[PDB]
Amino acid sequence: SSVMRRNEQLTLHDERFEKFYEQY
Amino acid sequence: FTYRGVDLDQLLDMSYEQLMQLYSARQRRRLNRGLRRKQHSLLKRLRKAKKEAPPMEKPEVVKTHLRDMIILPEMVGSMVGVYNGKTFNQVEIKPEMIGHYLGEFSITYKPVKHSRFIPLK
Amino acid sequence: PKKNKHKRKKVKLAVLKYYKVISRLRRECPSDECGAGVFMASHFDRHYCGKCCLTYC
Amino acid sequence: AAHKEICAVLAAVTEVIRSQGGKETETEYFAALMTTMEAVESPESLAAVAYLLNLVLKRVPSPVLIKKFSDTSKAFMDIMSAQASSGSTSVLRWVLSCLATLLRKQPVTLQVYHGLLSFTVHPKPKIRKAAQHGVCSVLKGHPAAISTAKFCIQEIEKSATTTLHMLTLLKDLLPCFPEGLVKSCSETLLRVMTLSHVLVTACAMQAFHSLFH
Amino acid sequence: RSGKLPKAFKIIPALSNWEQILYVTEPEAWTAAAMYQATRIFASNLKERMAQRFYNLVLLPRVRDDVAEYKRLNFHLYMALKKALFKPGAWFKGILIPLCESGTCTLREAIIVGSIITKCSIPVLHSSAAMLKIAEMEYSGANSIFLRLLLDKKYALPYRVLDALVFHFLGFRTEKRELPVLWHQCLLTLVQRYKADLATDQKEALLELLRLQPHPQLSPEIRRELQSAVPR
RNA sequence: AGUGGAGCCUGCGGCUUAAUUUGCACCCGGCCCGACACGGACAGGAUUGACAGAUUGAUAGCUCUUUCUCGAUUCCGUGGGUGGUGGUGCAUGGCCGUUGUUGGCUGGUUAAUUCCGAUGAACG
Ligand SMILES: [Zn+2]
């Protein structure tokens, strides 16, 4: 986890990243 | 027509085990060494062509690459399109080629087809 | 004899032929892995199914 | 994984299991497992109890073996009958091993030794080799030398691959023979020199080498 | 060599004890065409777990063996990997990430896998997950090629994934080791494709990286692309 | 003593053919498969995997008919503009080898401590 972001101008998809490393 | 004193009608009835004496040495040894399965499939295709053809003209041609297959006495009535390198030479099976192979009816090479100085000064 | 690529036939609404009005127009596969929704292919002399080859002729 | 451990049969059985009940050694384990020996042909269990009988009995229970040598004699003879009727692999080998231990630590003894020597010409190599080592240990540890020497003479005179094995027996047993039986065995070896086979000749040369060495 | 395999081999995914059947069939002695057909059948019958285990146990060791032996991937095995990428979840979790985490990935396999990735279309969620997986592991020489080729796949990049990539770049300030310019090429690709998704403190972080870790040729181009970058 | 004379076969030439490989490219067939940009098709579903019968010289969904399934993992064409499991040469970090002395048996199998099968230390 990081500290900064892109801040403004909306989001489209939060992305599902926990379906790859959690398998093994 | 008779072959080695044996007519075609009894040749059809005369079976696989005692084919030895009516042949030459080479195909006798070839049959003694064990016949394979690919030429059996070729026999099956030839006879499948032989069934459903109407019986008042010559049946449909069966084509193959097999140049080295022993002609059985029961081949009389087939049409064999044997490869030569480029094309299929399709030939009628007469009763007279029982002892021969399929290679000598498919020639792989064409025949070969192959003025003097006079001083003036 | 160029290397042409086979094109899948865009059949128009191949989905909308296994149901009427309710029930199944085709049979249901009795398999353990799948079935009751995997439609049973019924060709003019035979049958053809999805996964584990439960085939009837 | 369970044979290389200290608690396994490689080390624990040899040291602490001979002390049955704190005193070494007791044949109460042997005296209560006749049910495995008779009317049971379960594989790999008779072999295991024969291995245990071979390994435990080696700690010289001489008065016990003297007093119940008769019981062990009939027990091992019915074992011989059962294994001849069945034809197993490991049970016969370790029961010949425990027979060897019994005969080394110790009329009935003569017939037990005769049976042990008769089960030496078995075609199976493990049984035959176990009987070979057993007869070698029993004779070298003798009033029974005449019996085994005349048995070897009669076994040669009755006859082809077992001749090499019993020639190895003769090679390991010529020095512990009486003089007349030494002369008879030398005459028999000289008779079998006449064959043109080289393997029996080499076995006889090694027997002569072990005798004269 | 050619033709069709017996159809009993194709009922292996329909079985329950498929691992024992796989061990009976001895996959280490298979040929390239047989393994290609096996990967095709395994990817054509769902069940991402068994496909991932097959890639972990069979396909990846064979790829390692013939790359170490013949110095090039096989033709039918290249097709096998292309067929395995048709199920991207099994291919990422079964081949790419374990080989990156092994720490002994060769450059030849790195270039081959990157060319396979750039041959194909990667889903945006799967590409972002791959980015996050690469950015979270330790640094290796061949991993920069994977990251650069995934970056010039040119997909949309989320918040946390891009920030994890940025801090992966920021994790190199105390490193006095000589650094390849391939890492700088991955960095230049990131800047060139995502200059509008770069905030301020990231930009001065990259300027102080270029000051701390300078390059004669490509670092001026990175400086130009950072200095002429519009935000938002 | 021969060859060069005759016959046999063998190499270069030459001639023939599909090739008469070479100082197996190919004959004749059948197979299999790069991104950049733009214009299209694309969940109406792009696409992957096929029961069968056969085309084929034989089979094979890699083929020719019949619809069953996986579903974005997409697939058609055009550019002298890049180009890629590209090939090749230079510099490059590690790593092998290259440039004395003294100790120390569950198993089946064969004649045979037979065959296979599990199974360490100092001194100069
Ligand atoms: Zn069904």
mmCIF file of C-alpha atoms in Angstrom, chain A residues 1-21 23-24, chain E residues 52 92-93 97-98 125-126 128-129 132-133 159-160 163-164 167 196-199 201-202 232:
data_model
loop_
_atom_site.group_PDB
_atom_site.id
_atom_site.type_symbol
_atom_site.label_atom_id
_atom_site.label_comp_id
_atom_site.label_asym_id
_atom_site.label_seq_id
_atom_site.Cartn_x
_atom_site.Cartn_y
_atom_site.Cartn_z
ATOM 1 C CA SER A 1 0.000 0.000 0.000
ATOM 2 C CA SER A 2 1.167 3.508 -0.906
ATOM 3 C CA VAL A 3 0.492 6.948 0.590
ATOM 4 C CA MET A 4 -0.309 9.177 -2.394
ATOM 5 C CA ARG A 5 -2.787 8.792 -5.262
ATOM 6 C CA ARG A 6 -4.021 10.411 -8.481
ATOM 7 C CA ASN A 7 -6.310 12.362 -6.090
ATOM 8 C CA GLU A 8 -9.077 13.792 -8.305
ATOM 9 C CA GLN A 9 -10.851 13.278 -11.666
ATOM 10 C CA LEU A 10 -12.962 10.255 -10.739
ATOM 11 C CA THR A 11 -12.550 6.471 -10.831
ATOM 12 C CA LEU A 12 -13.790 3.830 -13.271
ATOM 13 C CA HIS A 13 -12.962 0.383 -11.844
ATOM 14 C CA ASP A 14 -11.348 -0.447 -8.505
ATOM 15 C CA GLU A 15 -9.729 -3.628 -9.988
ATOM 16 C CA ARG A 16 -9.782 -7.073 -8.329
ATOM 17 C CA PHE A 17 -6.156 -7.907 -7.516
ATOM 18 C CA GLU A 18 -6.786 -10.508 -4.784
ATOM 19 C CA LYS A 19 -7.814 -13.300 -7.182
ATOM 20 C CA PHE A 20 -4.245 -14.094 -8.317
ATOM 21 C CA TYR A 21 -1.803 -14.331 -5.397
ATOM 22 C CA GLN A 23 -4.691 -18.996 -4.980
ATOM 23 C CA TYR A 24 -1.214 -20.114 -3.874
ATOM 24 C CA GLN E 52 -2.256 -24.030 -13.122
ATOM 25 C CA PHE E 92 -0.119 -15.888 -14.975
ATOM 26 C CA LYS E 93 -0.468 -17.871 -11.742
ATOM 27 C CA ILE E 97 4.711 -15.387 -11.436
ATOM 28 C CA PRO E 98 6.447 -18.619 -10.226
ATOM 29 C CA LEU E 125 -7.858 -6.317 -14.525
ATOM 30 C CA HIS E 126 -5.411 -9.155 -15.221
ATOM 31 C CA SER E 128 -3.142 -4.543 -13.380
ATOM 32 C CA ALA E 129 -2.911 -7.631 -11.157
ATOM 33 C CA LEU E 132 0.935 -5.315 -8.769
ATOM 34 C CA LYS E 133 2.516 -8.769 -8.515
ATOM 35 C CA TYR E 159 -4.388 4.257 -8.551
ATOM 36 C CA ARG E 160 -2.800 1.762 -6.160
ATOM 37 C CA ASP E 163 1.599 3.959 -6.985
ATOM 38 C CA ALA E 164 3.046 0.514 -6.218
ATOM 39 C CA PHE E 167 7.393 3.067 -5.064
ATOM 40 C CA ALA E 196 -0.729 12.492 -17.561
ATOM 41 C CA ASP E 197 -1.057 10.108 -14.583
ATOM 42 C CA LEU E 198 2.053 11.466 -12.846
ATOM 43 C CA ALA E 199 1.601 13.830 -9.913
ATOM 44 C CA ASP E 201 6.109 14.565 -5.869
ATOM 45 C CA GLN E 202 6.526 11.582 -8.182
ATOM 46 C CA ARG E 232 -4.477 15.233 -15.260
#
